[PDB]
Amino acid sequence: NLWAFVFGILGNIISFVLFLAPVPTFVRICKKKSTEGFQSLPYVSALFNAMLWIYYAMQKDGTAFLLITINAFGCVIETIYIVLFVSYANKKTRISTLKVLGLLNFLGFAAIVLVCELLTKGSTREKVLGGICVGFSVSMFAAPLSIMRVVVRTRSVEFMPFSLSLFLTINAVTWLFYGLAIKDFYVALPNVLGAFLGAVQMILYIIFKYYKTPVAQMKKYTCTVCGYIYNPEDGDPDNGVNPGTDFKDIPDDWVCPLCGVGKDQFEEV
Ligand SMILES: Nc1ccn([C@H]2C[C@H](O)[C@@H](COP(=O)(O)O)O2)c(=O)n1
């Protein structure tokens, strides 16, 4: 049907973009000739997921062509990210990555093919594969949930840029509507989860972006006995007050580092 086509094209465009999201990261990694502190799990994952979904679609044949084309392109692009990463990786990390690549992507996937080609056909095949795709896709939500957890725990949104959230959300509702059009609730349900979590991400961003007060706008205070000036940007490290500390967040048993008088003797500049 026409609808499924519109949402297929849309889904492909948006998801294409999201597949090109790690590119600056890899421009970096190619610069430094090191994978730095980056992990290969998102990539090994994204590839395994893409493969599972291609496999799922080949069972649905005709309608689901559009959820192959994107996943197909996934397989390539992720395969690229994996190669580069393994090129510029630590020996230790190189081997970690290769091991997970052999377990999940080669063996795991092969076992899945083996179990599906010889234990199911037809509808039972659809249900098995679908169940597995839903399961894995859902499991991949651990990374964004982790990110959310960090954002709330840290009251910052540095690790969670707004546009990634937006694009993930739009991707989610697009493939949701897509699943609805081909009446496939294996494609649709985890996109419900995804759209929900994305919305919650945008909400968290709007809430926590300007939570902490910028060190710049923090107020200087002065000891009216010493003349001493407290710089929040400088803080008072030698006496257990890390730089960037606000004056009001300083423990009330703190004193003027020069004069030695109480905090009550201080007044804003
Ligand atoms: N519940 C899901 C999860 C994923 N995908 C497919 C659609 C996208 O083509 C790809 C997601 O790619 P990405 O988010 O990286 O852009 O996975 C899907 O059809 N249904």
Side-chain angles (χ1 to χ4, degrees), residues 1-35 37-216 218-269:
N1 65 98
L2 178 42
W3 269 33
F5 191 98
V6 176
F7 295 138
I9 291 301
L10 279 194
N12 277 251
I13 298 176
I14 313 285
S15 310
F16 175 84
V17 180
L18 289 180
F19 279 124
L20 300 188
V23 170
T25 302
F26 282 88
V27 173
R28 155 65 175 193
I29 297 182
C30 291
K31 285 174 185 164
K32 188 193 183 167
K33 311 292 178 43
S34 179
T35 54
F38 297 109
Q39 314 301 285
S40 53
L41 193 56
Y43 309 127
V44 162
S45 291
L47 173 55
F48 184 74
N49 191 32
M51 293 187 301
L52 279 182
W53 280 106
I54 291 172
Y55 193 21
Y56 175 81
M58 289 170 52
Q59 267 39 247
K60 293 204 73 145
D61 291 310
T63 36
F65 186 74
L66 290 175
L67 76 90
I68 284 191
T69 44
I70 187 67
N71 292 263
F73 171 71
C75 284
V76 177
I77 183 61
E78 296 298 347
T79 296
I80 298 177
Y81 296 150
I82 298 185
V83 168
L84 297 177
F85 186 96
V86 171
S87 312
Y88 302 115
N90 212 11
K91 177 144 188 212
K92 230 170 263 200
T93 298
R94 189 173 301 229
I95 301 178
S96 294
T97 307
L98 288 179
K99 282 176 188 161
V100 171
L101 188 57
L103 258 59
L104 191 73
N105 304 267
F106 289 88
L107 288 180
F109 190 67
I112 289 177
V113 156
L114 181 93
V115 151
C116 291
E117 292 296 292
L118 282 73
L119 296 175
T120 71
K121 285 179 176 63
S123 313
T124 39
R125 169 93 50 77
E126 281 207 44
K127 300 169 72 178
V128 162
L129 279 189
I132 294 180
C133 297
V134 171
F136 195 78
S137 304
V138 160
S139 90
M140 269 194 63
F141 286 135
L145 280 180
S146 180
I147 291 291
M148 299 189 205
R149 186 192 198 92
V150 164
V151 158
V152 174
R153 225 225 323 128
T154 199
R155 309 304 158 99
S156 175
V157 305
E158 149 208 3
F159 283 76
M160 190 199 287
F162 176 88
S163 275
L164 273 69
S165 289
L166 187 54
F167 275 59
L168 290 168
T169 308
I170 313 305
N171 192 65
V173 325
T174 306
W175 285 107
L176 164 58
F177 290 180
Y178 173 79
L180 265 35
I182 66 176
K183 255 303 188 177
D184 182 303
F185 288 72
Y186 289 101
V187 165
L189 165 77
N191 286 291
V192 176
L193 273 84
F196 175 69
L197 296 161
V200 170
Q201 271 176 225
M202 289 187 292
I203 271 56
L204 279 178
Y205 182 90
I206 298 182
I207 297 171
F208 285 105
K209 185 183 178 180
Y210 297 104
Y211 190 110
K212 300 195 305 186
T213 301
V215 171
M218 296 202 299
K219 296 168 154 208
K220 293 170 169 54
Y221 288 73
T222 182
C223 177
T224 49
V225 186
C226 185
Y228 169 87
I229 313 277
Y230 170 85
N231 284 257
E233 61 176 333
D234 288 23
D236 187 20
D238 275 354
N239 297 121
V241 175
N242 293 76
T245 300
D246 186 287
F247 185 78
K248 301 196 174 188
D249 300 329
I250 274 177
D252 303 317
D253 63 279
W254 180 85
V255 302
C256 184
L258 301 171
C259 187
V261 300
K263 204 173 139 209
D264 67 293
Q265 310 274 29
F266 277 71
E267 177 192 10
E268 189 199 328
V269 162

